[PDB]
């Protein structure tokens, strides 16, 4: 779930003779790699999301006041989904929480329903117009990691994200980066830009020791998968229970260069 639904759940509809603005708060506390979602407006509900490009732009402040580009404000943010429910509007948005080693920090978006009402007066208080707003606040707490992701940065030996890394002088015999992983472990790797990743859907499927592609769903169901093809960056989390010792591989390759092999040894654990 992890969803702020202002259409159906945190309803922003105005009520008969409502005269006073109302604000509702939807607080989400995702873990790393999890997906958060806002639903704001539909074919029948005329509600507007602020900033309009949320989550690509967010507000740093709960009072809706300091606009940030999330790719700069929460480094690593890169996976986004958007959906229109009515023409020329984006009403449903999602983003996946990237690994973050900086302290916890909020990000805000807002859903608004507006209307102008006439306040009928009397006895020396003339009638007036009043704009009222039902505002939904989306507060996402960006969690903090206390250890590096178990995995391989093939772009630098001074990685801030990954437990192991390789310098350009080393990647310029194949490199085989091995991680030993247990249940619920967060793993991943990053390959240089113009390298190809096999299988393309690494972590949904992978190479096995026979060198064959296998879909991992029935052997080792990695969860919360991020396949950032734009940045050649891959993350997932090991399942909550591991009943067998497994080894799987993904391979980054570029013509006339050594291959960069990522491997995981998953061990029995609960």
């Amino acid at each position, epitope marked *: 779930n992890l969803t702020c639904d202002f259409n159906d759940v945190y309803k922003l509809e105005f009520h008969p003779n409502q005269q006073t603005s109302v604000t509702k708060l939807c607080n989400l506390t995702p873990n790393v790699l999890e997906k958060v979602t806002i639903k704001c407006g539909s074919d029948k509900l005329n509600y507007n999301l602020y900033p309009p490009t949320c989550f690509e732009e967010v507000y740093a402040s709960r009072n809706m006041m300091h606009l940030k580009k999330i790719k700069e404000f929460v480094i690593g943010s890169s996976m986004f989904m958007r959906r229109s429910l009515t023409p020329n509007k984006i009403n449903e948005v999602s983003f996946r929480i990237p690994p973050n080693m900086m302290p916890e920090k909020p990000i805000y978006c807002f859903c608004e329903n507006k209307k102008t009402i006439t306040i009928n007066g009397s006895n020396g208080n003339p009638s007036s117009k009043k704009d009222i707003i039902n505002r939904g606040i989306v507060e996402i707490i960006i969690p903090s990691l206390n250890e590096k992701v178990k995995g391989c940065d093939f772009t630098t030996s001074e990685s801030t994200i990954f437990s192991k890394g390789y310098s350009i002088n080393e990647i310029s*015999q*194949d490199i*085989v980066c*091995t991680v*030993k992983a247990h249940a619920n472990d967060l793993i991943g790797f990053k390959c240089p830009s113009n390298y190809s990743v096999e299988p393309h859907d690494c972590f949904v499927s992978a*190479f*096995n*020791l*026979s*060198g064959k592609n296998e879909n991992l769903e029935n052997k080792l169901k990695l969860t919360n998968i991020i396949m950032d093809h734009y940045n050649n960056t891959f993350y997932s989390r090991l399942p909550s229970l591991i009943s067998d*010792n*497994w*080894k799987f*591989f993904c*391979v980054c390759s570029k013509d006339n260069e050594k*291959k960069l*092999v990522f*491997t995981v*040894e998953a*061990s029995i654990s609960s």
Partner: nanobody
Amino acid sequence: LQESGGGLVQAGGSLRLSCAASGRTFSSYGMGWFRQAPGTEREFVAAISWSGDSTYYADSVKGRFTISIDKAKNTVYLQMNSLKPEDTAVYYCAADHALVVGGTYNYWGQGTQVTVSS
């Protein structure tokens, strides 16, 4: 790479294969035994982590073969028991990603032949 220890054995019997690596080229690597017979593809048999703390077996040999390692002498052993005619093949020692990287793997040796009579 020195691959040795193969030969002719009666069905039901045991053989112990040895793979001696006279270099540091393989100590970053998990190590595997692979096998191929005329008419079939090269297949995975068993692998062991560089520490020795982890082992993996092809389903068809689990419970009959054991892989083990002697790091001081850079040697990998495959102890084969209850041998089956199905096990007849040339056996090869290689880093355990050898089949993963395919045609770029540059250290395949001649291997050691194993024939199981019936």
